Amino acid sequence: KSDDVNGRTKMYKNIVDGNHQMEPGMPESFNVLLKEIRSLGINIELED
């Protein structure tokens, strides 16, 4: 409902088709947190 842009367009198609289901994905503001921590000398990642 809030952040994930591909998640909410999938949600809007699924609501107007009666589906009622969410494809979760990742918050885009967490990627903003990764870019702000990564823009320092810090190397944050996502393992596996």
Binding site: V32, S39, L40, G41, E47
Partner: protein, 287 residues
Amino acid sequence: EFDAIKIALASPDMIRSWSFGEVKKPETINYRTFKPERDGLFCARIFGPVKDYECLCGKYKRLKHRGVICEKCGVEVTQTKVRRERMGHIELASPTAHIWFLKSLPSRIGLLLDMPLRDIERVLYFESYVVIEGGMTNLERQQILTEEQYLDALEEFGDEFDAKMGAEAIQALLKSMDLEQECEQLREELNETNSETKRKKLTKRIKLLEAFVQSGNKPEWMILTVLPVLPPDLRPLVPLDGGRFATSDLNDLYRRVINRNNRLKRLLDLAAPDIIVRNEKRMLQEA
């Protein structure tokens, strides 16, 4: 999808692997039109095209060749959100130690190089000299040096003698700091003493010395050599209702670091005296 989040230091090779192009010029945008700067902070080739699947300047106005980069445009050809994930890197002329590892209380470089914070800052702001593997002289490795202490030493130990200053000197010290060797020494020092205060002072130093060896974090990664810049989309430049651009604060910070770095490269490329440049590198360090 993914388990744990791992945090570590950023190597200069790692920062060059994040990057997509060196941000040279500090010039933000044109400001009289709508176009940005080639190649400044808000570049085209280093990051991406403002418009989706369009060369900002002029070629590819349909959906067939997504990627071609002509010489007239010096532009990539992808999505509007592609610039939000892409980051640039500023080649800092003079080495600058991180402030998060120099003033964290306790400082990461304060309890690692066995040197007081006060003395660390003095040398870091071009106000004190530091020795580094002098040689056959009467001086320690951690012991610092002043103008008078260096002048006399300069005329004394003119040969095999090394006494730098700033982040460069600090970097060397960290770089030439056998972690493993210190472990045993510290461990042996803790088992050969009874001093309560010393015990706690030695156990806090050996804890951060063996933890650095357990991971892939290097001692020379504390000093920033390849400063990384945050994506433009994340430092947005939108105008408010009117005809001017309400600019963010990070654009002021990055534009000053790039202005000073260009000045320092020009002073270093003019073969001017070796001292000149202390104020210039100090202003870059503070920037």
